[PDB]
Write a protein that binds this ligand. Structure first.
Ligand code: QCX
Ligand code: QCX
Ligand SMILES: *[C@@H]1O[C@H](CO)[C@@H](O[C@@H]2O[C@H](CO)[C@@H](O)[C@H](O)[C@H]2NC(C)=O)[C@H](O)[C@H]1NC(C)=O
Ligand SMILES: *[C@@H]1O[C@H](CO)[C@@H](O[C@@H]2O[C@H](CO)[C@@H](O)[C@H](O)[C@H]2NC(C)=O)[C@H](O)[C@H]1NC(C)=O
Ligand SMILES: *[C@@H]1O[C@H](CO)[C@@H](O[C@@H]2O[C@H](CO)[C@@H](O)[C@H](O)[C@H]2NC(C)=O)[C@H](O)[C@H]1NC(C)=O
Ligand code: NAG
Ligand code: NAG
Ligand code: NAG
Ligand code: NAG
Ligand code: NAG
Ligand code: NAG
Ligand code: NAG
Ligand code: NAG
Ligand code: NAG
Ligand code: NAG
Ligand code: NAG
Ligand code: NAG
Lengths: 772, 772
């Protein structure tokens, strides 16, 4: 046990490897810099707090600092919290940083700062001033920043943080910063490319601005430049989910043909949402090392059919030409240029939102000999007609995405339509070849549909209109298939011979296929699992299963079954003993999720009819009012038990008398008010205990023995109704001097009383009066 | 040992017998009321602090308070500290006390208060407002104080705290205080007796004021009155050591003959310094229960010879008639009235400063039959001639004081001449009959001087001019004598037969008789102790003894010897081995004080030549630079060792190996910088350790075993040079969590560094950084 309790409301970590003393005070509702931070502290984080000022006294002793993270302490109105708004901007007093000799990184994002903090140490390499109110950069301001390498000045003038004027940058403002490597000026209302920039630059971000034209001499000296982003300058504002204003007369970002002549070392060129109509081949005359080219959200639908520029990119790896569609035009077919065959290196190709009625083998002919091609993304294209057998010339490919289409007989939810994807805050693919057909209109399936696709390892048929009775003669060609996602469909389990043709299948997802289970008298064959000789994981979540024609599910291979969101309460209706041995015959089963099954009580015989090798069992979100803990004696292999979000008021008299196997117990979000006299007594196998978010008042030494407690990896106690009287004298002392990992010890492990101590942390408590 | 360290800078005590939670913060340099005082607190003391205000928030939780001691927090300029002066008077905000339902006592003395604190609880019994600036009492102000029993309003307008006006009291101001028992108005510039006072009063103090006359009806209703003080009204200002102003024309305090007619229950009447010339017998017509009458500092020298009033006082116990002398008259003899014989009850009689040349048996004749008489004080009388054989008619008497006179062949230093002896802040007699002849002019003594005084048990001849060679034939009659104080004389130890005639003597004090020891070649016989067969204690302090004709002191009875302030360094001069066994032959000796003997080093053989039963040994204030601890193996009965105020730098490697008996070790005010690796290891007999006022930086677990430390009754560590680094991690934790009585833990047990911790108490320290 500890000699001195850790009273500091910050997570202190030690990294002797790099001699870093990391102090983390992220979102600890601070109003002052916490007193008593180690002198040997190097990395200090104070994000999402309410510290109103930074005076020299702030970092006084800690002269060993190398990083200061003072982000979002006064986050702008439109970007930050409306319940707890910032009253006055962060006040940085002079000589606050100049003393910190060893400082290398300084983050001051979202603090409503009016100017570049002067008096900074010459050791600084990184300076972040994002989301502040600095929209006038002058040469005098950056004189102190001589040694800076990475500079973030972005988000200082945009729709979420306006300045109502254009961004101003002095002539040759960044020119004397002879060590500058990274420069971000994103989301700033910048009208023209700041010049002259230092030749030492390698990354340049000028996206989401007022730049309407590029000069030929704009990047004449940036020979060392590797990444350049000129996106959101003359944007394609159609269906934009953010205030978007395009260049007058819908004009594109005017770039001279010889503008990228100096950028020999350029690898990434992002030209997303620039209203571009033509891509001149002359652009890439001297860039033979380009690997990533983002040409999404432009008007290059006609240019895709020509694309003479592709001949100058034989080293290109990534090509994004998404949402280049001409509105009012619903194309019959996709015109792909024969030039796409000259992309000898290309691994990733993305052509979403081209918009066309029909997909044919002939259309994809220029890609037929692209040896390195791994990904083909043709999603959100409204393709009505497509013959899947055409992808036999694409066996080498890892992912063939056709998600969100209208075919009938991993990137984020918002990727191409978000203002800034790289904005800062405060999956079956592994199995092999994947064909994504999710969110389509396939209403009926047959063996002939998957002809020649024997090679597939994963197939996604989620969100289709398959309202069929499968007899195991629908996916006959897919012999190699290991994963099938059949979620969000209308599966009809009339036959127990369903899915049996997929003889190599390891993962089956039949979740959210509730339609037929939601109607009375319909035959449901859940014993279909028996024929799947290699099935490892099965998901039948949110299916509303209240009836079953088969009394048992059979399997000699299955290890994981997700049965969350069904009606086991109806299958297990007290008096009805027919479905109590339902999961008993899934012999190799180790994991069983029977959460969200409306089980207010578990009928006697559920524990006896459990598979022999069950390890992890969840009964979470069931509204369980009563539980017979003693019955866990049947679950002889049990290690984990999730009983979170229930109505349980009492723990067992002796946990060791219930299970000798049980390691991790979860009892969070219940109604427990008091633990039993000798609860955890003699339960030496226990390694994890969550008792957080309950109504517990007192915890005694008998209920929580030290020999049992000191072997726990983590003990969760936060959000309880703790009474800090003289009877809680053991608990207060134990919690303070323990080595056991108690999370939120200085934010949610607090007293509800008596009076004097109401709303005070138990860690800060001093019950010396109980000792006089 | 403790679970929660006591961090509060106040001495917290618990007396479950009276249910009092006593919190004492006397002189703890406080500027705010210390946070975290027990809620169960009843008695709270905050004297000699710098708390500038009292707001309702002050005693918020502690509603169980019965006593509040908020004295001297703003003590007036002339009365308080000049280095740390009070800037602005104590500010008592409204409703600060009204909430404290159970409050009984409230002390607000010396806070420069301008008015009576309003809004006080109706439960209050005692209110103290001494040394404030309240010199105008109005009826409206005391309406809240309905239930008050004891009231202190004194020292609000005197020479140390002026108000430059007369004290004002409304007509019938205290009349409605129907429960008032005590009322002090001392040192207040009061011109007339406040009337009408409540009949319920028992104690009245009106001393040191401007009262020139008493009215007959002034005490007409105070039938219950027990004590009345009217002193310092028309004072005797001759030789006054304070600004004294007497009544015009040196007039006495005019008291009507019938003024004390209502005071039947009066027991104490103090009329000190009232310039009185005649005491009318009519005063005591109805007071037959009076026991204490103070008539000192008046002009009753002629009245002492008449004293017709003494016939009305046959129940009187104490009679003080000191300093009544007439300036310009050095009387031939003391004229005592034959009326003194009517004082059948009198135990104490004091007649100092009558000023007379000669004392004779005949003069004291009225006291010859006073059966109860115990004390006769005839000091500071300038008596030139007196025959001590006259006190044979005073064998019954306990004390016959003749101290400070000019005879030649317990009260304080300032008692009769101090402004206020009862002012508030922020001895052989036990042996039997005593004759005090100290501070006289006796130059020669003989057996005939003490003729008939065989009965005496204690004789004080301190501070006389006895420059004699005693041969043991000077005090032959004093056979019963058990104590002789012969200090401050010029004893000449030419004969070893000195003092031998006092065959029943237990205590002899020959201290400060340095005269002859301060001159070379003179014979000194210290072996004179041998003939005193019952001597228990001997004091020969500050005698400057550097030589002795006798090499050894012999005694079979002596148990205590004080040899402080001599020159043992010269007697024990390295090379001179003659006086090393000096104290060896005092066999029954248990205590030996050899402090202040200029012993920078102890010569080898001093320990071997020590009496066999020595228990307590002081070597304090010697300037001891080096000590051979191992040599304590000779002192086989030693329990206490005082080595305070020396130049010692090191402790022994193992204290347990130096003595087997040592219980209490004192090492305060030394130069110790570090303790030995296993200092207190196995020292099971140790119970007291004073390591205070040294230069110790660190203390380790090995030096202070937990097994030895618990046996310690008290451990003194304060005023040391403690370094609060990570090496002091054990010491900081031990001190915080120990039950061992460590005094000044929150005022002098503090860090000298490193930087961050400089001037911080070790009890408040949190070295959690040393644990990460
Ligand atoms: C009203 C609900 C009754 C159950 C009874 C199934 O024994 N029917 C059905 N349940 C489900 N889940 N889906 C469908 C879809 N069509 N049908 C009707 C149906 C189909 C086939 C057969 C069985 N025919 C076989 C019998 C053996 O020789 C070969 C033909 C009988 C049917 O209804 C009685 C369904
Ligand atoms: C110069 C210092 C020498 C010492 C020597 C003492 O053996 N004398 C004296 N020391 C002290 N402390 N005080 C006095 C006061 N008078 N005398 C002189 C004195 C007195 C008596 C005797 C001894 N007479 C006794 C001896 C025994 O048969 C009967 C006569 C001798 C003296 O000086 C030599 C003193
Ligand atoms: C502590 O702060 C340092 C300096 O700010 C961080 O160092 C960076 O570490 C990454 C690798 O983790 C490197 O790629 C960067 O180049 C380093 N930056 C500098 C300026 O040296 C470090 O990661 C921080 N550690 C934690 C846990 O916050
Ligand atoms: C970007 O800069 C333009 C100016 O170039 C800002 O537009 C002005 O806004 C004010 C207040 O809304 C108007 O009164 C002016 O007429 C506008 N001028 C022009 C030329 O349009 C614009 O507000 C800035 N953007 C942001 C987000 O602050
Ligand atoms: C006691 O009251 C008297 C008033 O009766 C004060 O005496 C006055 O003092 C002021 C200032 O020292 C003088 O201007 C007056 O002339 C004084 N008057 C008289 C009649 O003495 C006296 O100062 C008060 N005593 C104290 C201790 O404050
Ligand atoms: C593709 O588009 C180009 C124009 O961009 C056109 O000349 C060509 O004929 C088209 N090819 C096909 C097969 O549609
Ligand atoms: C789909 O293409 C394959 C050849 O890849 C062909 O055998 C099959 O008949 C086609 N399907 C239809 C419905 O035309
Ligand atoms: C199948 O596609 C859907 C999107 O329609 C997605 O939610 C799911 O995660 C995909 N399946 C796999 C195995 O990743
Ligand atoms: C399965 O159903 C198909 C029609 O979907 C039918 O042609 C086939 O004969 C059926 N096979 C069996 C074994 O039921
Ligand atoms: C499934 O369920 C019933 C028996 O309960 C039976 O009709 C059917 O043939 C069983 N099939 C398998 C695969 O066990
Ligand atoms: C505590 O306060 C009460 C009331 O004033 C008093 O009678 C008692 O003697 C006090 N005791 C101490 C130790 O202060
Ligand atoms: C004592 O004094 C009184 C006067 O006070 C006087 O009458 C009397 O004779 C004196 N007696 C003696 C003995 O001095
Ligand atoms: C002292 O008084 C006594 C009687 O008390 C007497 O015998 C003796 O002679 C007196 N002595 C002197 C020196 O006056
Ligand atoms: C003897 O009188 C003196 C005062 O002259 C005093 O210091 C000493 O304490 C008295 N002796 C005793 C035994 O009290
Ligand atoms: C003691 O001293 C006295 C006084 O000086 C003297 O009369 C007597 O003879 C001395 N006796 C001896 C034996 O010294
Ligand atoms: C004191 O010692 C001296 C010699 O040192 C001797 O003459 C004298 O008689 C001794 N007295 C006693 C009482 O021992
Ligand atoms: C001191 O220690 C030594 C060695 O440990 C031992 O021989 C000796 O007797 C000890 N002496 C005492 C007084 O304890």
């Amino acid at each position: 046990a500890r000699w001195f309790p850790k009273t500091l409301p910050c997570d202190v970590t030690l990294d002797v490897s790099k001699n870093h003393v990391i102090v983390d005070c992220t979102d600890k509702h601070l109003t002052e810099i916490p007193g008593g931070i180690p002198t040997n502290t190097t990395n200090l984080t104070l994000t999402i707090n309410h510290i109103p000022d930074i005076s020299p006294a702030s970092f006084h002793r800690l002269v060993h600092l190398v990083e200061i993270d003072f982000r979002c302490n006064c986050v702008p109105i439109r970007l930050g919290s409306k319940s707890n708004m910032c009253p006055r901007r962060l006040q940085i007093k002079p000589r606050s940083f100049s003393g910190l000799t060893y400082l290398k990184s300084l983050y001051l994002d979202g603090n409503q700062l009016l100017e570049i903090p002067q008096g900074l140490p010459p050791s600084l390499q990184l300076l972040s001033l994002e989301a502040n109110n600095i929209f006038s950069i002058r040469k005098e301001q950056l004189t102190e920043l001589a040694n800076i390498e990475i500079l973030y000045l972005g988000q200082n003038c945009y729709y979420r943080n306006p300045c109502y004027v254009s961004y101003s940058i002095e002539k040759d403002a960044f020119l004397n910063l002879t060590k500058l490597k990274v420069l971000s000026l994103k989301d700033n209302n910048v009208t023209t490319v700041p010049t002259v920039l230092p030749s030492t630059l390698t990354e340049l971000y000028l996206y989401n601005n007022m730049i309407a034209e590029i000069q030929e001499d704009d990047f004449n000296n940036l020979n060392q430049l590797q990444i350049l982003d000129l996106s959101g300058n003359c944007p394609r504002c159609y269906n934009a989910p953010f205030p978007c204003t395009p260049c007058k007369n819908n004009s594109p970002l005017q770039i001279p043909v010889n503008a990228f002549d100096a950028l020999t070392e350029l690898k990434v060129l992002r030209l997303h949402s620039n209203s571009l109509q033509h891509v001149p081949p002359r652009w890439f005359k001297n860039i033979n090392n380009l690997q990533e080219l983002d040409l999404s959200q432009n008007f290059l639908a006609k240019e895709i059919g020509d694309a003479k520029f592709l001949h100058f990119l034989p080293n290109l790896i990534q090509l994004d030409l998404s949402f280049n569609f001409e509105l009012q035009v619903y194309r019959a077919s996709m015109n792909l240029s024969q030039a796409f065959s000259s992309l000898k290196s290309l691994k990733i190709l993305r052509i979403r939102g081209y918009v066309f009625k029909e997909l044919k083998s002939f259309q994809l002919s220029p890609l037929h000999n692209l040896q390195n091609l791994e990904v083909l993304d043709l999603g959100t294209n409204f393709i009505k007609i497509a013959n899947l057998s055409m992808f036999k010339q694409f066996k080498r490919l890892k992912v063939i995405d056709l998600s969100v289409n209208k075919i009938s007989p991993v990137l984020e939810q918002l990727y191409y339509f978000r203002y800034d994807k790289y904005a800062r805050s405060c999956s079956c693919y592994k199995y092999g070849q994947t064909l994504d057909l999710s969110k389509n209109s396939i209403f009926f399936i047959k063996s002939s549909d998957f002809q020649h696709l024997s090679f597939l390892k994963c197939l996604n048929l989620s969100g289709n209109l398959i309202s069929q009775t499968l007899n195991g003669s629908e996916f006959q060609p897919l012999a190699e298939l290991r994963y099938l996602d059949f979620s969000n469909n209308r599966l009809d389990l009339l036959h127990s011979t369903a899915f049996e043709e997929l003889r190599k299948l390891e993962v089956l997802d039949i979740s959210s296929n509730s339609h037929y289970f939601q109607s009375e008298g319909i035959t449901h064959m859940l014993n279909f699992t028996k024929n799947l000789k290699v099935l490892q994981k099965l998901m039948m979540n949110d299916n509303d299963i209240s009836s079953s024609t088969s009394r048992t599910m059979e399997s000699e291979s299955l290890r994981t079954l997700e049965f969350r969101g069904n009606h086991l309460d109806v299958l297990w209706r007290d008096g009805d003993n027919r479905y109590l041995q339902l999961f008993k015959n899934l012999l190799k089963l180790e994991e069983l999720d029977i959460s969200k099954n409306s089980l207010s009580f578990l009928p006697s015989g559920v524990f006896d009819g459990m598979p022999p090798n069950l390890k992890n069992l969840s009964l979470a979100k069931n509204g369980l009012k009563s539980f017979i803990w003693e019955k866990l004696r049947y679950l002889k292999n049990l290690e984990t038990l999730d009983l979170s979000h229930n109505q349980l008021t009492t723990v067992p008299e002796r946990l060791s008398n219930c299970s000798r196997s049980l390691k991790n117990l979860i009892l969070k979000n219940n109604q427990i008010r008091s633990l039993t006299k000798y609860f955890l007594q003699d339960a030496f196998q226990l390694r994890y205990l969550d008792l957080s978010s309950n109504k517990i008042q007192m915890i005694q030494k008998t209920s929580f023995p030290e020999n049992v407690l000191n072997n726990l990896k983590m003990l969760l106690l936060h959000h309880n109704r703790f009474l800090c009287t003289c009877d809680a004298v053991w608990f207060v002392w134990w919690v303070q001097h323990t080595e056991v990992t108690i999370p939120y010890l200085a934010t949610d492990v607090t007293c509800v009383g008596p009076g004097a101590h109401k709303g005070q942390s138990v860690i800060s408590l001093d019950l010396y009066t109980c000792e006089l």
